[PDB]
C-alpha cells in the first residue's frame, strides 16, 4: 500500500538545526509532490512547502523561507526537511503528506505518522514510576509516571494484553517536567488473585520500568 514513514522524535537545543525524514513506499516516488505541515501542540495546521522528487523543484510558504529546506533522495524514496536556527516556536509535530493532481483538488491523500520536535534547553529526566493500589465488584488500579522530560512516554498494562478498561491521561507540564497517569479497571476476581503490572518506556532517557501493582 501507499505509505509514508517518518523519522523519530527529536529534542534539540535552541539555535541548533534538525533534519527530519519521510520515506515513501508503494508507489512511484518521483511522480507526486511531497508536502510538509506543522501542527503546534494544541493548534491548527500550517503548510511549510512541497517538493517534486522527480526533479527536486520546491515551492515554499514564504513564512518558512530560510527556516525550512526541502530535499529528496530519489534512490531511497526519501524526502527530507531541515529546520534551522531553532527556537521554542519551532516545537511542534511535523507531518509529510503526498498530494495528488488537480483532478483530485490537489488534495493530500497519504500522511506520515508525524515527528515531534522539542526545542528546549531543559534537561532530559527519566520518569519515576509509582504503582497505585487502593488504600483497602470492579477494582481500579493506577500508575503515576512523574517528573520526566521530554515527551513522550509509553504506558501499557500487562505488556499490552490488558487493553480494555484503560484510561491514559494527557501529560501535564510544570517546571519543565511532565507527569501523567493511567488507570485500569478490572474485575475484583482478577486482582490481586492475578497480577497487574504497569509498563513504562521513556525512549529519550533509554529507560524501561515494570512495576507490579501490589495490594496494600
Amino acid at each position: 500500500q501507499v505509505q509514508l514513514q517518518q523519522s523519530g522524535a527529536e529534542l534539540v537545543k535552541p539555535g541548533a538545526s534538525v533534519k527530519i525524514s519521510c520515506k515513501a513506499s508503494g508507489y512511484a516516488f518521483s511522480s507526486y509532490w511531497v508536502n510538509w505541515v506543522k501542527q503546534r501542540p494544541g493548534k491548527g495546521l500550517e503548510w511549510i512547502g512541497q517538493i517534486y522528487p522527480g526533479d527536486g523543484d520546491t515551492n515554499y510558504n514564504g513564512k518558512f523561507k530560510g527556516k525550512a529546506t526541502l530535499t529528496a533522495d530519489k534512490s531511497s524514496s526519501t524526502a527530507y526537511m531541515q529546520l534551522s536556527s531553532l527556537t521554542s516556536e519551532d516545537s511542534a509535530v511535523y507531518f509529510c503528506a503526498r498530494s495528488r493532481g488537480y483532478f483530485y483538488g490537489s488534495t493530500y491523500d497519504s500522511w506520515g505518522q508525524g515527528t515531534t520536535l522539542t526545542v528546549s534547553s531543559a534537561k532530559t529526566t527519566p520518569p519515576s514510576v509509582y504503582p497505585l493500589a487502593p488504600g483497602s465488584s470492579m477494582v481500579t488500579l493506577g500508575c503515576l509516571v512523574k517528573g520526566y522530560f521530554p515527551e513522550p512516554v509509553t504506558v501499557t498494562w500487562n505488556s499490552g494484553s490488558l487493553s480494555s478498561g484503560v484510561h491514559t491521561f494527557p501529560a501535564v507540564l510544570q517546571s519543565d517536567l511532565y507527569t501523567l497517569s493511567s488507570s485500569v479497571t478490572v474485575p475484583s476476581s482478577t486482582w490481586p488473585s492475578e497480577t497487574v503490572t504497569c509498563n513504562v518506556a521513556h525512549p529519550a532517557s533509554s529507560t524501561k520500568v515494570d512495576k507490579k501493582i501490589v495490594p496494600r
Binding site: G44, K63, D109, Y130, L144, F169, P170, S181, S183
Partner: protein
Amino acid sequence: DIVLTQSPASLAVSLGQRATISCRASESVDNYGISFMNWFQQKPGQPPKLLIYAASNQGSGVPARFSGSGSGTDFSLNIHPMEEDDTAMYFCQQSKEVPWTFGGGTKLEIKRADAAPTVSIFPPSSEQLTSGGASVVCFLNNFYPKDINVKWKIDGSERQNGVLNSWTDQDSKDSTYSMSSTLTLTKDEYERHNSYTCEATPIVKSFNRN
C-alpha cells in the same frame, strides 16, 4: 494568501442527527469549474484523514454519510447520520494558491445521556514516600457531560494549591469523558493530615492515612 474561516469552532450533535460545518475563503478557491477545497478529519495522535476532495467527492473508502457542498468562497461539510466514532477535529483546506492553507478547525463532539463518573482515590505509593514526595491521585472515569468539577478536601477543608488536572478526549465508542486529578504535597505535609477526599460535582471518595 487565502484565509479559510471555519464555523462553528465547536459543535455537539446527537447520534443519528446532522452536523454541518462551514468554511469560507477570503477569495475563490476554484478555477475552470474545479474546486481546490478539501476536507479532513483528525483524531487524537493521528495525522489528518481525507474525507472530501474537490468540494464534493468522497475520498477512497469514505462513507456516504460524509458529503460536501459549495463553490467559489463558500463551502460546507455535512455528516448524516452522526455516529459515535465521528467525534474528532475537522479541517477545511485549500490547494488553489501557494501557500496552501487550512481552516482553524471545528471540534465536533457527540451528545449522549448524562453519566456520573466512577471515582477512585489513591494514597501516595510507599515508593514515592521514600523519596520525600506525596501525590494523591483521583480518577473520575466515564462521565458525561465533559464539564465536571473536582474538589479536594484534607481533614474536611477544601484544598486548591498543588492540584493538577488532565482530561481525556471524548471516547470514540461510548462518548464519555474521563479525568485525572493529582494533588502533590511533600511527604511531611502529607503526614501532617489524616483524611483525604476527592469529590466530583456530589460523588465522594476518601481514605485516611494509616
